């Protein structure tokens, strides 16, 4: 019991360090900077190909080939410039929660509600796409998949663990066990050296794939968090929660840096992503729309209402040309 | 203007036609979520029909393709994935009827039924409940009567009202009675017509679904 008391002493110590030796004053490091007024973005293309509610969005480094899966078990690979389709990959584990896209452009990741992270091959000979490996080893459900390279892959599985594999072996080469809840979201760094994961414990942790021990733990919410994304500087990450609060956490500061909320939103997040400069934050609420926050002033810059049902995932290009709000109304938009 | 991209548009149109026929194939099929208490009675009503986290049970009965999902062997936060099951036609909520005396357990199934019945994603979807184990409940009332786990009960300690009382006790848990129906059939090892009751309730919900899509409702 005294070991629990010493654990509470350590928690009080890491709260006293980020309380006394941290002097944020970030109503003053943002009143000097000018706002962005109000940004106006319109639906350039309505990618209309699914027949069910979708759950995933990730674009490649080409900024054209986005992947998107839905309830019907038909993840299709779109084309951002020409509205066309290039692949309609059939799959078995139809209750898909998430997808990803390899930075080389060769693979996609799938993953459903039945503990199977399927990775597919695209740039292959011998015809169509082909199920390369069947990554398993969890107990709960896959929630967010991401690629490091064509060799390695990290995920975020509902049985409290995050995992780093090797694809050609399929065994969990590194586990990540630090939570007491279901890790709902997962995001990577621009150098892909260290990632961050958000769970049901109202806490987002920063893991590193070198060793496997979580380096810092970031709390501050009141409920589950459903969207994590690193800032493009690689030194901050935005957490959306079910408390209508997409607060921005700072790694070097090591506390909650600032909080983003509004009065008449008592609603829930589903997806959060930055631009390529991070002045604006694409918070995808469940108010059948998504908002665009001026991410260094905690002010709203835009309202991208273009749907009829709640958005689920929201990807931004690697070169900052578009966002892709994908709603449960099956008609994922591309804004600009 | 579309030099070789005409063949790309033709490829997209071909696989779009494939997506359309696959969507029609999924539309004429009908899915049923299958809940249940922990090791209570769901092992019977996956065997009464023709027949990893989720495991499908794809069967058919009278020109109609059923897809059961006995999900309940997956231990996680149920609220953060149950939203994938909206738009399901029926939710078979299997309850052991004779588990009323164990360490309480009937109140655990009441809590799970109150969770799924008043759930915000399932406020329109009808729910079927299969009170199993009639072959044990007819003789664990004469000897170890129902007065243990119902203090507000009095009188009929026979089968002819006890299962009806537990049926009314479950049916009195919907707060929205004018929108969703709660069906009940007492399954048993003999007279394998439980799939007939599944077919009847799914037909009765397909009628309401087509009236809602047509505009009568």
């Amino acid at each position: 019991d005294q070991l629990r008391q010493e654990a509470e002493q350590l928690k009080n110590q890491i709260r006293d360090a980020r309380k006394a030796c941290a002097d944020a004053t970030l109503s003053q490091i943002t009143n000097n900077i000018d706002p962005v007024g109000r940004i106006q973005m319109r639906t350039r293309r309505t990618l209309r190909g699914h027949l069910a509610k979708i759950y995933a969005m990730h674009w490649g480094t080409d900024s054209r080939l986005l992947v998107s899966a839905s309830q019907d078990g038909k993840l299709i690979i779109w084309d951002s410039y020409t509205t066309n389709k290039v692949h309609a990959i059939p799959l078995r584990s139809s209750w898909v929660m998430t997808c990803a896209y390899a930075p080389s452009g060769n693979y996609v990741a799938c993953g459903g509600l039945d503990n199977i992270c399927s990775i597919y091959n695209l740039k292959t000979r011998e015809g169509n796409v082909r199920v390369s490996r069947e990554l398993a080893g969890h107990t709960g459900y896959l929630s967010c998949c991401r690629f490091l390279d064509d060799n390695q892959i990290v995920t975020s599985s509902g049985d409290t663990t995050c995992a780093l594999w090797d694809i050609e072996t399929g065994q969990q080469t590194t586990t990540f066990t630090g939570h007491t809840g279901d890790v709902m979201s997962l995001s990577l760094a621009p150098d892909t050296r260290l990632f961050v994961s958000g769970a049901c414990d109202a806490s987002a942790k920063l893991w590193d794939v070198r060793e496997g021990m979580c380096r810092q733990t970031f709390t501050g919410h009141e409920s589950d968090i459903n969207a994590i994304c690193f800032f493009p500087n690689g030194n901050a990450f935005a957490t959306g929660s079910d408390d209508a609060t997409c607060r921005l956490f700072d790694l070097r500061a090591d506390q909650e840096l600032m909080t983003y909320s509004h009065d008449n939103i008592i609603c829930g997040i589903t997806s959060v992503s930055f631009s390529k400069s991070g002045r604006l934050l694409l918070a995808g609420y469940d108010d059948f729309n998504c908002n665009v926050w001026d991410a260094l002033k905690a002010d709203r810059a835009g309202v991208l209402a273009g749907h009829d049902n709640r958005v689920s995932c929201l990807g931004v290009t690697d070169d900052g040309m578009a966002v892709a709000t994908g709603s449960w109304d099956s008609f994922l938009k591309i804004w600009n | 203007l579309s030099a070789e991209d005409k063949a790309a548009v033709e490829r997209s149109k071909m696989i779009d036609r494939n997506l359309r026929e696959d969507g029609e194939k999924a539309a004429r099929e009908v899915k049923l979520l299958l809940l249940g208490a922990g090791e209570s009675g769901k092992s019977t009503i996956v065997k009464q029909m023709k027949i990893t986290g989720i495991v499908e049970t794809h069967f058919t009965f009278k020109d109609l393709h059923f897809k059961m999902f006995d999900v309940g062997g997956q231990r996680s936060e149920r609220k953060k994935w149950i939203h994938c099951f909206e738009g399901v036609t029926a939710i078979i909520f299997c309850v052991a009827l004779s588990d009323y005396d164990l360490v309480n357990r009937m109140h655990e199934s009441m809590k799970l039924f109150d969770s799924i019945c008043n759930n915000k994603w399932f406020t329109d979807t009808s729910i079927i409940l299969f009170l199993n184990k009639k072959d044990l409940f007819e003789e664990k009332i004469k000897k170890s009567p129902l007065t243990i786990c119902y203090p507000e009960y009095a009188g009929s300690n026979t089968y002819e009202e006890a299962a009806a009382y537990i049926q009314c006790q479950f049916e009195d848990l919907n707060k929205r009675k004018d929108t969703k129906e709660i069906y009940t059939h007492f399954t048993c090892a003999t007279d394998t017509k439980n799939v007939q009751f599944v077919f009847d309730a799914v037909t009765d919900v397909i009628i309401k679904n087509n009236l809602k899509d047509c505009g009568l409702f």
Partner: single-chain antibody
């Protein structure tokens, strides 16, 4: 991947002959298909095309009306029923696989070919140099001018390069001027602009000797250059 043509032979002028191309080891019906032909001492000439799903069919002008291309997708087989065959049709007939989507590599596999000996507006792809001698290890630059600009408003330039080693079927090297086809060594590189194109080989190695074809894929009919020959 295997493609096996058959149906070749000797035919009297005015007669008919059906060629078959049997595909195996790949998802045949997902691919568009072409026939490309090669007269005895001459270059490549495109004959006919069937898209995935058979919705789109194109013929070369010199063969339209006379040749019919068709496919039997359940049996994974392509046919070309030819009628009223003339002496000018004597050629090796190649079956060619293709697929058109963003980043795809069309024309990436050719059959072994069948010889059909017969008894007795278009974009011009000028290749002014018919042969070039090359000593091993050196580096070479071949040029290929086009009669029309191949740069399209989308930014892609639809120029393809093939290699036919002596006695073998042709093999794709570069698609859309500068992208290396799968399996092709990095000694090949492509460059160019509108109406002007360049193939460059660095440290040329053995067996690389053969005929190099330029090809336009801007509009139908597809047209080839006269071919550049290497020699030891």
């Amino acid at each position: 991947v295997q493609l096996v043509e058959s149906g070749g032979g000797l035919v009297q002028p005015g007669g008919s002959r059906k060629l078959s191309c049997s595909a195996s080891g790949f998802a045949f019906s997902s691919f568009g298909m072409h026939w490309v032909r090669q007269a005895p001492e001459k270059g490549l000439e495109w004959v006919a095309y069937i898209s995935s799903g058979s919705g789109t069919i194109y013929y070369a002008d010199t063969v339209k009306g006379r040749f019919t291309i068709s496919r039997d997708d359940p049996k994974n087989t392509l046919f070309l029923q030819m009628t009223s065959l003339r002496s000018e049709d004597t050629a090796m007939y190649y079956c060619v696989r293709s697929i058109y989507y963003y980043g795809s590599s069309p024309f990436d596999f050719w059959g072994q070919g069948t010889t059909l000996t017969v008894s007795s507006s278009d974009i011009v792809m000028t290749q002014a140099t018919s042969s070039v001698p090359v000593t091993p290890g050196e580096s070479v630059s071949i040029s290929c001018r086009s009669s029309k600009s191949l740069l399209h408003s989308n930014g892609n330039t639809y120029l393809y390069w093939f290699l036919q080693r002596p006695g073998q079927s042709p093999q794709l090297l570069i698609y859309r001027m500068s992208n290396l086809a799968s399996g092709v060594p990095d000694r090949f590189s492509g460059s160019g602009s509108g109406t002007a194109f360049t193939l460059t080989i660095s440290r040329l190695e053995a067996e690389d000797v053969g005929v190099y074809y330029c090809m336009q894929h801007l509009e139908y009919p597809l047209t080839f250059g006269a071919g550049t020959k290497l020699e030891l």
